[PDB]
Design a protein around this nucleic acid. Structure first.
Ligand SMILES: Nc1ncnc2c1ncn2[C@@H]1O[C@H](COP(=O)(O)O)[C@@H](O)[C@H]1O
Length: 169
RNA sequence: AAAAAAAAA
């Protein structure tokens, strides 16, 4: 019943998160991670629910909601970076229809299996064009590719390939 | 063109 909720605006507070998540169910605790001494926020926080059926509800309901201008990425807490660093179930999407946001991106790929974390990246002028979707399974990822890479999504043709970090790149 | 993230203070 622990949730990682990130992509937070450097000013979002534990109080604002409480007001945000409280509706999903009773909270055990909320904590926004900040730099040891400067206290500068680290752009993410833990939201601990009392009932996992609440944490799960909040995850399946408040995902992508905007706070102080930013869409929050919510996922089950998983402090071991191994999978993330190894992007095995992680795919890359290029050439998005701008009208395409996180939610839209989630719905389109969720069919292939459980996705751990997805984000359509945007900048001041919006949708920026691409994003990623980390599936819990590389079998899921394999099926996403192929069954999506190419075919037109919102008039536009998309490129779906394995993630490939900046180094490989 | 385009190639993310997470330090329980
Ligand atoms: N300080 C903490 N407060 C609340 N829950 C925690 C804390 N540290 C760890 N946990 C939870 O306990 C699990 C196992 O450690 C974590 O994955 C979290 O869900």
């Amino acid at each position: 019943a622990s949730l990682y909720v990130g992509d937070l605006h450097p000013d979002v507070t534990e109080a604002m998160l409480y007001e945000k998540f409280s509706p999903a169910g009773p909270i055990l605790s909320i904590r926004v991670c900040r730099d040891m001494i400067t206290r500068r926020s680290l752009g993410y926080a833990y939201v601990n629910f009392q009932q996992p059926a609440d944490a799960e509800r909040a995850l399946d309901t408040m995902n992508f909601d905007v706070i102080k201008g930013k869409p929050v990425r919510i996922m089950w807490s998983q402090r071991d970076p191994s999978l993330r660093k190894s992007g095995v179930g992680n795919i890359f999407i290029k050439n998005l229809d701008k009208s395409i946001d996180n939610k839209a991106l989630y719905d389109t790929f969720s069919a292939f299996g459980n996705i751990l974390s997805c984000k359509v990246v945007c900048d001041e002028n919006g949708s920026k064009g691409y994003g990623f979707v980390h599936f819990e399974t590389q079998e899921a990822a394999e099926r996403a590719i192929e069954k999506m890479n190419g075919m037109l999504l919102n008039d536009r043709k998309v490129f779906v390939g394995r993630f490939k970090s900046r180094k490989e790149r």
